[PDB]
Design a protein around this ligand. Structure first.
Ligand SMILES: O=C1C[C@H](c2ccccc2)Oc2ccc3ccccc3c21
Lengths: 290, 328
DNA sequence: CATCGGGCATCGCGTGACAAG
DNA sequence: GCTTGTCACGCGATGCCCGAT
């Protein structure tokens, strides 16, 4: 068709859609301001909106509104610790609905004092020397919770915040700080263990077989997941597979699944020998559902 | 003068007075058009009306002024710890709110995305999925969003469906809006950035127990020299899908002094797998083997999986994938 | 208690200048 | 040198207000 004419009509349509958008926004403003929706023209709606915004009023949201949105989205509590000693510099009130602990228990504490001892080492690895993401077990007999932490390393002190002379923070002199959020949270698979039974390699198909993620098994002994009436049989199988190197030993036992159910599993086990010194590197296991 | 222009000037005066009150820096306000001026005015009003009904401090026992200053920024601190951005989306797929950090992850300005169709930011093939997540409450899914940074970024959305009060729909009850946090994704593998000629050499005992390592090796694998020799032989470092290949090539090296090119995965100190193309040589002393010198070059995941697809021997566990740990 | 014409105010439409990209 | 969009402007068709019937 005529190029000039279709350009003209497209432009007219664009302007008409712009006008319609403007009037729709005017109607939204009339719906949003106080006594407009209790009808007026465009100018009065605009003046009343101007007055209402003058009443209401840089960031689009206040700090508390942003915090509210984040917490409503995915819970969590903010903690700022020092990377030197783990000293808890700040902790929000959200630690109470998350860990069932008052703010006082964390203030004057250190991050290592609030999580499981077996994780302390790991936390050091996460605190030595931008983004950080890890999983630990925090306190609340003592009871622990798996807590996922996502945060970042920030130069201390922070900008904008005043640090008075008589403040407890005035003498610490920390250079870096971790600012993070903590939140509550028939196939087969192969695995490699040490001669004592500790999961040192876990196939990803574990999820489809026992319901665990690989990280939930690595480091733990396989006997911890086995039924007590089969624990000694499994331990004897692991003991004898070491003595008969290269030989394959099969053992059937009950495995505690993710739902804490009992799954009957057949485990084939043999040893991997160093091709120079013939020493056992690890035990290869194929664990199959039955 | 004439009546039409006078009315238009009265409208423009009201529009500019609306713009001067928007909660944005003036360099953002000055480059706004009238349409987005009205749009973000509506957005501010809707947000304030929602927070008036949904919203409303350190313990007085734990009150110091420095802690008070930290509390007055707690919101920005959470936002920066998100590693991503906030997104509140109405039932009409309109962006009720998006935090500023979206610009850091997608390149879109906050003032341009608020009160707009969220589908404009989402890949078409994924839009339907998002809609199915917009209609128990807790939500956890993945979507590819448009990325203008320097074309699309896959992102994990973790959120909830909650009633968006104070919207004055016509009087309709509030609709379920999605409050979510969008974060990037994760791979468990180390690819070098300066990949090219990052060849590093390692020294080993005859049983492939590390004894020395060069600087580039400490950079690639992430172990210190002392840490590399305290975890047993190198077979504790090898992916379970490569242990038999490494053993076969170790036998070859024992037999003829040279192993040949072998592609396999080493376990970093971050418990990640990194591909290496290696060649293990036997050094001698008085005619008897003394130690091993292995010169490795890091590979990308692409070249590594190509080598695995073109594997010489067919061996058990060849296509197995998994995670590992290492102790001393 | 309306109804009726004045003249100015609202308002939607199409087009042209102008500019970012 | 083309495309999409913003802003202003001219222009009628109704709107509102209000003396004057
Ligand atoms: O070259 C290596 C790397 C590695 C290693 C390097 C650094 C740290 C830990 C482990 O062990 C090996 C074990 C068996 C091999 C067989 C053939 C060729 C190379 C190897 C190698």
């Amino acid at each position: 068709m005529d190029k000039e004419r279709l350009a003209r009509e497209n432009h007219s349509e664009i302007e008409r859609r712009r006008r319609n958008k403007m009037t729709a926004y005017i109607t939204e403003l009339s719906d949003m301001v106080p006594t407009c929706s209790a009808k007026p023209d465009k100018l009065t709606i605009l003046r009343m909106a101007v007055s209402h915004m003058k009443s209401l009023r840089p960031s689009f949201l206040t700090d508390q509104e942003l915090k509210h949105l984040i917490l409503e989205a995915a819970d969590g509590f903010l903690f700022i610790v020092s990377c030197e000693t783990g000293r808890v510099v700040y902790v929000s009130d959200s630690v109470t609905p998350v860990l069932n602990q008052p703010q006082s228990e964390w203030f004057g504490s250190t991050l290592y004092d609030q999580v499981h001892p077996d994780d302390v080492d790991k936390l050091r690895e996460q605190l030595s020397t931008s983004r950080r993401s890890f999983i630990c077990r925090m306190r609340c007999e003592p009871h622990f919770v798996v807590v996922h932490c996502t945060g970042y390393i920030k130069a201390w002190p922070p900008a904008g915040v005043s640090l008075p002379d008589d403040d407890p923070e005035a003498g610490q002199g920390s250079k870096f700080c971790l600012v993070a959020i903590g939140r509550l949270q028939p196939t087969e698979f192969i695995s490699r263990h040490n001669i004592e039974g500790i999961f040192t390699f876990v196939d990803h198909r574990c999820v489809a077989t026992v319901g665990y993620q690989p990280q939930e098994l690595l480091g733990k002994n396989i006997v911890e997941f086995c039924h007590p009436e089969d624990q000694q049989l499994l331990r004897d199988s692991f003991q004898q597979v070491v003595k008969l190197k290269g030989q394959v030993l099969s053992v059937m036992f009950r495995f505690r699944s993710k739902n804490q159910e009992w799954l009957w599993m057949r485990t084939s086990s043999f040893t991997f020998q160093n091709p120079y010194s013939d020493e056992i590197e690890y035990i290869i296991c194929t664990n199959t559902n039955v | 003068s004439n009546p039409s222009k006078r009315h238009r000037d009265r409208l423009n005066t009201e529009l500019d007075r609306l713009a001067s009150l928007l909660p944005f820096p003036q360099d953002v306000i000055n480059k706004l058009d009238k349409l987005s001026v009205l749009r973000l005015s509506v957005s501010y009003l809707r947000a304030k009306s929602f927070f008036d009904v949904s919203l409303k401090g350190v313990q007085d026992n734990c009150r110091t002024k420095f802690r008070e200053g930290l509390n007055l920024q707690e919101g920005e601190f959470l936002l920066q710890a998100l590693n991503g951005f906030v997104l509140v989306v109405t039932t009409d797929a309109l962006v009720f709110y998006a935090s500023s950090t979206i610009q850091d992850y997608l390149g879109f300005q906050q003032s341009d995305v608020i009160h707009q169709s969220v589908y404009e930011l989402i890949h078409t093939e994924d839009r339907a999925e998002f809609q199915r997540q917009l209609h128990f409450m807790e939500r956890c899914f993945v979507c590819r969003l448009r990325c203008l940074l320097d074309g699309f970024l896959a992102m994990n959305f973790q959120g909830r469906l909650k009633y968006l009060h104070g919207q004055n729909k016509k009087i309709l009850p509030p609709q379920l809006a999605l409050f979510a946090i969008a974060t990037p994704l994760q791979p468990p593998s180390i690819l070098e950035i300066r990949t090219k000629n990052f060849i590093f050499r390692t020294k080993h005992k005859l049983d492939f127990t590390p004894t020395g390592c060069d600087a580039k090796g400490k950079i690639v694998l992430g172990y210190t020299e002392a840490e590399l020799c305290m975890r047993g032989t190198g077979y504790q470092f090898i992916h379970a899908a490569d242990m038999l290949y490494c053993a076969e090539y170790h036998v070859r090296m024992i037999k003829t002094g040279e192993s040949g090119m072998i592609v396999f995965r080493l376990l970093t100190k971050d418990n990640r797998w990194t591909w290496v193309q290696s060649n293990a040589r036997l050094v001698y002393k008085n005619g008897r083997p003394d130690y091993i010198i292995a010169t490795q070059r890091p590979l990308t995941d692409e070249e590594g999986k190509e080598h695995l697809r073109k594997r010489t021997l067919k061996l058990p566990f060849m296509f197995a994938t998994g995670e590992a740990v290492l102790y001393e």
